[PDB]
Amino acid sequence: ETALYLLPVTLGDTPLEQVLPSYNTEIIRGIRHFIVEDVRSARRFLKKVDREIDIDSLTFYPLSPEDISGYLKPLAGGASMGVISEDPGADVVAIAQRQKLKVIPLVGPSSIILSVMASGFNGQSFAFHGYLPIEPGERAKKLKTLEQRVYAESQTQLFIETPYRNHKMIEDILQNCRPQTKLCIAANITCEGEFIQTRTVKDWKGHIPELSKIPCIFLLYKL
Template identity: 60%
Template structure:
């Protein structure tokens, strides 16, 4: 019997056509699966239709995994694999298990010695590092910074210090509607000479990736409202 696998299926980072960022091999894999673990069923169904217009969406089984999911239920999502059927994990954008709840499923699969297969696809974090001009040999991703203003400023200063003391690129993200506020805090609390890269809508038609010293960004921030953005700082 063919081995049942857990596939990590990257999605597009925006409205980019599937064939621009995903290889044909991914489409073949997706078309052969009948079980998917997803953050949002509606957007996952739309993505699958973009991959293969002939796919019978109603014949598929979806398991929803997001901040509302009871973590005690996650192991059951792998039941198809235990009975010999492969399963795919689909993120809302980019690569599953990177700043994504899919990591919890992967951890269970690894613990059960289920083979995990990551498929090729766009990662906004890696693409931002590639295009920033910053250190690509040593970098740290901090996810979302604290919501509390005082704690967020402390964290900003901490990661900035790491950029200088460890010669390490620092990455973080924010909820898109709060991008502007975070950018303004970086300009207010980081050193004037610290380099800041703002990477927005990566791989999309209106992609924007620009690096400047903090002082050069002052009074010169782009429109970031509701645009998926990666912030990177470096010495």
């Protein structure tokens, strides 16, 4: 019961009972020390999970490796702690691990696997690369590399792009990839306005949507 609990939040503006299992509420009602990135939004979230909680009398910890080790002390002493994250948290888990403290991850929404699931691609072997290079040619060569890995290693390739650039990317995808390579575009995941469909590169030409106001995940694979 004494551990650094990892409490996930919703992916977008959707109700809590939709992506967070009730269990997370129960254990949250048992913590008083929360390591948070943004104090006002964590409080905003904690109110969203239960009005009954004393929002005013809780110890939040905004998140340096020296301060991290300090914020972990209540846990070292035996108190249930919690980290509410969307990644300013990986470092807190990492150091907790180094100090051989108990870390426990609670279930929550993940755009990476939700897209792996609705893409229709090989889920037993996929790789996420975060963002791709900004400088063209480099970005044009990475796509090439990732696409070759698809065919060589039967590994699904995923990545992301900032919203106002989703079109430059899809344009870079349909201009540098093989006509028959497969692409899945996953937008407002769980947001209900959600767009996750898969098509051949060659066939995205005529029915490509907007999606420049929300981030989305891109996946490449084969037939």
